[PDB]
Amino acid sequence: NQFYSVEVGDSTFTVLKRYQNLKPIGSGIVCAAYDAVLDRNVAIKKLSRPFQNQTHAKRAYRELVLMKCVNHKNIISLLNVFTPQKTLEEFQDVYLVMELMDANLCQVIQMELDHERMSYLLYQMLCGIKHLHSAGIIHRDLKPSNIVVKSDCTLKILDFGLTRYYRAPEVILGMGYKENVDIWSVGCIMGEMVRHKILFPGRDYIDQWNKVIEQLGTPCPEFMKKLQPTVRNYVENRPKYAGLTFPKLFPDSLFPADSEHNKLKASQARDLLSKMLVIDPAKRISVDDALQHPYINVWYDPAEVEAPPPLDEREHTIEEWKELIYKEVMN
Numbered sequence: 001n002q003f004y005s006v007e008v009g010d011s012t013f014t015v016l017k018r019y020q021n022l023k024p025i026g027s028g029i030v031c032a033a034y035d036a037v038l039d040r041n042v043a044i045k046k047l048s049r050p051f052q053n054q055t056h057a058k059r060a061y062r063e064l065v066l067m068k069c070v071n072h073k074n075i076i077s078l079l080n081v082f083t084p085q086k087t088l089e090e091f092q093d094v095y096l097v098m099e100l101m102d103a104n105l106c107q108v109i110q111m112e113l114d115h116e117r118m119s120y121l122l123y124q125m126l127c128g129i130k131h132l133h134s135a136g137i138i139h140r141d142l143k144p145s146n147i148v149v150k151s152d153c154t155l156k157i158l159d160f161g162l163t164r165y166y167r168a169p170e171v172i173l174g175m176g177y178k179e180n181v182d183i184w185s186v187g188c189i190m191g192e193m194v195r196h197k198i199l200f201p202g203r204d205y206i207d208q209w210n211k212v213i214e215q216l217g218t219p220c221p222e223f224m225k226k227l228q229p230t231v232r233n234y235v236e237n238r239p240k241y242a243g244l245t246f247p248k249l250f251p252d253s254l255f256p257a258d259s260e261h262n263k264l265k266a267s268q269a270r271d272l273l274s275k276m277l278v279i280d281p282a283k284r285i286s287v288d289d290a291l292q293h294p295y296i297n298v299w300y301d302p303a304e305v306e307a308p309p310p311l312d313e314r315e316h317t318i319e320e321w322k323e324l325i326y327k328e329v330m331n
């Protein structure tokens with residue numbers, strides 16, 4: 001038999017013999033191992049009875065189908081998909097072996113970043129988001145914990161979307177959305193790279209909206225009327241805020257600006273934040289326009305952005321789901 005069992009913290013990883021010296025980075029649970037066939041490190045993800053519920057089964061199938069479908073240098077790639085269980089009656093675990101990077105984007109927010117590396121990181125996030133939007137996939141739940149970094153600094157994205165600090169007002173207020181809903185989430189990550197404090201740290205959905213209007217200000221009347229009247233009632237009732245200007249939100253001291261190059265790049269950065277951190281999606285800058293911003297466009301590469309783009313969203317019983325995933329694991 002090809003596999004071998006190894007104990008890792010709580011769970012028992014029973015992987016192939018090609019993967020050796022596993023190291024835990026979990027929560028699915030994630031292990032970092034060495035592939036002996038490919039001669040390089042990989043990331044193994046144990047899906048523990050992934051068909052356990054519709055939320056689990058729907059996302060896991062979504063993450064399966066899309067990764068073997070999509071192929072980008074900013075969305076992590078699948079290298080091997082397998083299961084130790086031979087039959088469907090025995091089927092219990094799905095292992096997703098996929099490309100390994102060096103660190104998490106949270107680990108990066110704890111650091112001082114020069115404009116050169118920061119604007120390149122952000123550029124990369126936009127490239128993947130753009131390419132996802134061209135497949136008809138809008139992420140929505142974009143977060144740093146779901147973005148991985150190499151010591152390059154090259155960037156890749158782990159998940160495909162759908163801790164809540166990075167969701168857009170329209171997502172929070174159930175308005176319905178469009179492509180540029182991921183420009184909000186980036187502006188939350190960019191501003192966090194600056195402050196090092198999380199921008200809108202709300203304990204609940206209602207509490208999080210307060211931390212938006214305190215800093216940015218109560219959105220325009222034109223925006224208000226597009227809401228669910230029942231929800232619109234609540235927002236129109238909340239106190240009015242003048243909304244602090246972006247120099248006051250991101251003061252001089254935050255940015256590295258000792259040289260003239262840095263001084264210019266600091267305003268170009270704040271000019272970007274100001275366009276991304278907008279409450280009304282009708283006034284919020286688009287991915288296409290953001291890549292053309294003087295801060296970002298210095299990295300532009302059509303070979304990456306304008307790359308070729310590559311089924312439904314249905315309910316299934318957990319008996320129906322099982323077979324569905326097993327089918328796509330056996331491929």
Ligand SMILES: N#Cc1csc(NC(=O)CN2C(=O)CCc3ccccc32)c1-c1ncn[nH]1
Nearest residue numbers: 025030032043045098099100101102103104148
């Ligand atoms: N799936 C998958 C993954 C494919 S790659 C990857 N993670 C990385 O590449 C980088 N990374 C982390 O992110 C967590 C911290 C960490 C420590 C040591 C080595 C890599 C990582 C993951 C992952 N790590 C944690 N959850 N998911």
